[PDB]
């Protein structure tokens, strides 16, 4: 019987800073035990300082990104070139996803950018449209490997102040773009080591008030 879904592997990661936000994702595309491409980007600049990635079944992911990019275009036409805020984009994506509630897009979607106060924002979606704003989110094949490490290093979970008898927690603070990119690179090199579907290359998209910058790094190709 024809199965309309497939697993293209890969993993993605979104972190939010004080005045910036990053959305990373490996460039490997796979089916079963074969490599399709060592460089197939799945993190996209969608305009209005919104970056997006829909990881999982690539065909559904490409369809979704394509439709959201088009939603942004028509938002400009219908509302006098108004900038689509990240929170408005998130709600719009929910309706795109839930629109196919009974034949879902098999993807974990993450978007990143700046909120209306200029502060870093990351939103994450399930396949049918449930969404939530967070400081931190990993998605895809190696999400289970990366996410607990982020809880520990970004949100300082389970870390207490030395000598305080485990009474005072380590205080929360925003990380610099330099410190965040270190965590992204270490997260992906670790995931590459222990997950077979993750590797080849790492592409990071950084979002500040100035625009959208890109950075690329090599990953192990085995």
């Amino acid at each position: 019987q024809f199965n309309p879904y497939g697993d293209n592997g890969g993993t993605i990661l979104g972190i939010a800073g004080e005045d910036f936000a990053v959305l990373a994702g490996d460039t490997r595309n796979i089916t079963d035990y074969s490599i399709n491409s060592r460089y197939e980007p799945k993190v996209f600049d969608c305009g209005d300082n919104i970056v997006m990635s829909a990881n999982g079944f690539a065909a559904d992911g490409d369809a979704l990104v394509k439709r959201f990019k088009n939603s942004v275009k028509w938002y400009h036409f219908d509302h006098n070139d108004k900038k689509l805020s990240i929170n408005s984009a998130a709600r719009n994506i929910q309706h795109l996803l839930y629109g196919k509630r009974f034949f879902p897009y098999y993807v974990h979607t993450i978007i990143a950018g700046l909120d209306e106060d200029g502060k870093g924002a990351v939103y994450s979606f399930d396949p049918v449209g449930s969404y939530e704003r967070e400081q931190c989110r990993a998605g895809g094949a190696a999400a289970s490997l990366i996410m607990p490490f982020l809880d520990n290093q970004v949100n300082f979970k389970n870390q207490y102040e030395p000598g305080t008898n485990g009474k005072v927690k380590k205080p929360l603070k925003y990380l610099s773009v330099e410190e965040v990119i270190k965590l992204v690179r270490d997260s992906f090199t670790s995931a590459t080591e222990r997950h077979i579907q993750v590797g080849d290359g790492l592409e990071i998209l950084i979002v500040t008030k100035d625009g959208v910058r890109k950075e690329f790094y090599e990953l192990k190709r085995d």
Binding site: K66, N70, K73, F77
Partner: protein, 231 residues
């Protein structure tokens, strides 16, 4: 007389009066000018107001990053046709990953307007359009009429007293066509062209409306203080 009740009726001399009356709505509309060189294409539009307390009716509409038009006549009909162009431009991008040719844009508009002139119940569109764009074969300018007739031109003008600007462009043809790699000078030629259609009124800051598209220039519209340079 007896043959102007609907669009489905021919007159004894072979005329479609409802289509002609739709053409008349364009002549009452405010003047708009179109012209192009080899690198850029420019739209200049005189906007009209109800009174001093009102805003000035927007004449120019964007269709894609590389295409757009100006209107003269019924504005709601321009909104329908421009929306159709937006969808066709968009279909071409999503399906074929291809920017829609300005010539095809014209062919599609022609065919949409035509269907309204051969069927009972409907009516012709009551608006004239000047479409500009930059595609794989360079800069383009089209003139749409609601009879269905679409015409590719170097320059033109439609609306009330459009004959003045049309005569000027016919004289200036050899000059403005060679304004390559110079946006501001091509606009100046268009602003001087539309000025030949002015009576008693002159071009003010919230009256003039300019749009441009070209080789390394997306379709953008200039209004307000952004057109003060050209007065």
């Amino acid at each position: 007389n007896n043959y102007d009740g609907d669009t489905v009726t021919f007159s004894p001399t072979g005329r479609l009066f409802q289509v002609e009356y739709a053409l008349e709505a364009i002549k009452q509309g405010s003047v708009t000018v179109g012209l192009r060189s080899n690198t850029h294409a420019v739209l200049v539009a005189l906007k009209r107001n109800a009174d001093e307390l009102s805003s000035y009716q927007k004449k120019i509409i964007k269709c894609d990053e590389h295409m757009g038009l100006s209107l003269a006549g019924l504005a709601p009909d321009a909104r329908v046709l421009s929306n159709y162009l937006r969808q066709q431009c968009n279909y071409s991008s999503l399906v074929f990953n291809r920017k829609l040719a300005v010539e095809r844009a014209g062919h599609l508009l022609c065919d949409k307007a035509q269907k309204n002139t051969q069927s009972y119940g409907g009516r012709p569109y009551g608006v004239g359009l000047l479409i500009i764009g930059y595609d794989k074969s360079g800069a383009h300018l089209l003139e749409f009429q609601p009879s269905g007739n679409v015409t590719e031109l170097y320059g033109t003008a439609i609306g009330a007293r459009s004959q003045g600007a049309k005569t000027y462009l016919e004289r200036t043809l050899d000059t403005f066509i060679k304004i390559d790699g110079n946006p501001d000078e091509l606009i100046k030629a268009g602003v001087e062209a539309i000025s030949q259609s002015l009576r008693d009124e002159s071009l003010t800051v919230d009256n003039l409306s300019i749009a441009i598209v070209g080789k390394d220039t997306p379709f953008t519209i200039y209004d307000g203080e952004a057109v003060a340079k050209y007065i």
